[PDB]
């Protein structure tokens, strides 16, 4: 998979640049990089192809380049209508196509809001049902992009972690939920567990102790 930043944010009129690191087997091996925009609940749209070229009827604000194994997408003068997810794709020396992880691009429409995060331990009831689930809930954050990181004590944890896609509230802020399923034993063995949401450079952290 190609490497794109999880999220980039800016103000309207401001200029932005998404990077797309790759290898010598694709991006660095060919000048066939394409960029796609996917606006919410819609289907992808070609913005750039062969690195820098713009299909007919595509804004002069979308620019593309490349350097070694890393190509870029540069939006000049962000409009709100640029909001959405962006995917870079390259030809490979296996004659396959590859996609990047995707980058949620946010153009501010309302003043930034730091998330409100709460962490629940497993209920006694679930634990009598021989199961365990830590619920990590996040609300009231804008832009609508966050990074959920779980940690068992000091060490990070990736297995058994589920995270929903941010959704809009009644107050137009964003919310997201992250579950960490555990066995009753795993849950008893560790000192504590950490939920770490990263939002706009800032990171909040709550912690549940089985104790």
């Amino acid at each position: 998979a190609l490497t794109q930043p999880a999220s980039v944010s800016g103000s309207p009129g401001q200029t932005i640049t998404i990077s797309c690191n790759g290898t010598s087997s694709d991006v660095g091996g060919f000048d066939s990089v394409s960029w796609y925009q996917q606006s919410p609940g819609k289907a992808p749209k070609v913005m750039v192809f062969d690195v820098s070229h713009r299909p007919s009827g595509i804004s002069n604000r979308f620019s593309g380049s490349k350097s070694g194994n890393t190509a870029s997408l540069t939006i000049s003068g962000l409009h709100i209508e640029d909001e959405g997810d962006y995917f870079c794709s390259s030809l490979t020396d296996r004659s396959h196509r590859i996609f990047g992880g995707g980058t949620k691009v946010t153009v501010l429409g309302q003043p930034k809001a730091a998330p409100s995060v709460t962490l629940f331990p497993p209920s006694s009831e679930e634990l009598q049902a021989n199961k365990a689930t830590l619920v990590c809930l996040i609300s009231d954050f804008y832009p609508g992009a966050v990074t959920v990181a779980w940690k068992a004590d000091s060490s990070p944890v990736k297995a058994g972690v589920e995270t929903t896609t941010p959704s809009k509230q009644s107050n137009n802020k964003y919310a997201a939920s992250s579950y960490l399923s555990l066995t009753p034993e795993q849950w008893k063995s560790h000192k504590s567990y950490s939920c770490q949401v990263t939002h706009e450079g800032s990171t909040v952290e709550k912690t549940v102790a089985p104790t």
Partner: protein, 235 residues
């Protein structure tokens, strides 16, 4: 004009076989290459397969482990994808995408290949809203409701909610104190865990002062299984 429509989707059993069908229009079908692109819920795009114009050449993703086969019927302007031994992790959105293409020019003259077929271009210029595919076997089942009690951490404002887990199929409706409670209420979207069953969570923000003087009860209605539940959440 240039358009693709995806169909043949729905909910299917693991280990079963499936066959999707894309339908084009507004362009010369038998001149372009075709792609399948999938997108697991909330995930990123993923390449599946590419078929040549005449359909005598196919390319598949090395991570599909050869569980997929791509085909086409140019006389019907229709593209096909077919599965075998589906898996729950095969849950995703399945897009149909044309491969850009056309003549190639040196000087002022343009050259084709034999038959006057287009050389390929390397960017999917046409997309059709994918049809969705869901892999789960669990017969209709009712949900279990566990209390997410107010952490001892909170003065200020406290948060508490219900963890409604292990139901099928969607949807589930979640109210608080019988609808009387609305402000500060956030009901999250459901997740499909490995289980093949759905889980979700509804939470409500309140003044920590209200704790012990105000009774919070989440009302869960899972119409499919005809199950209604009432749980009290307390410190």
């Amino acid at each position: 004009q240039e358009q693709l429509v995806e169909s043949g989707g729905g909910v299917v059993q693991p280990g079963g076989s499936l066959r999707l069908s894309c339908l084009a229009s507004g362009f010369t079908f038998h001149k372009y290459g075709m792609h399948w692109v999938r997108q697991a819920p909330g995930k990123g795009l993923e390449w599946v397969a590419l078929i040549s114009d005449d359909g005598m050449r196919k390319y598949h993703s090395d991570s599909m482990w050869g569980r997929v086969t791509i085909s086409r019927d140019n006389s019907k302007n229709t593209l096909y994808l077919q599965f075998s031994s589906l898996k729950v992790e095969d849950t995703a959105m399945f897009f149909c995408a044309r491969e850009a293409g056309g003549p190639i020019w040196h000087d002022d003259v343009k050259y084709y290949d034999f038959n006057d077929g287009y050389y390929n271009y390397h960017y999917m210029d046409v997309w059709g809203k994918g049809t969705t595919v869901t892999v789960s076997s669990a017969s209709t089942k009712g949900p279990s409701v566990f209390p997410l009690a107010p952490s001892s951490k909170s003065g200020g404002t406290a948060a508490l909610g219900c963890l409604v887990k292990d139901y099928f199929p969607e949807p589930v409706t979640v109210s608080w104190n019988s609808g009387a409670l609305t402000s500060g209420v956030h009901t999250f979207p459901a997740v499909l865990q490995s289980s093949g069953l759905y889980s979700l969570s509804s939470v409500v923000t309140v003044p920590s002062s209200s704790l012990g003087t105000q009774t919070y009860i989440c009302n869960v209605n899972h119409k499919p299984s005809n199950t209604k539940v009432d749980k009290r959440v307390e410190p």
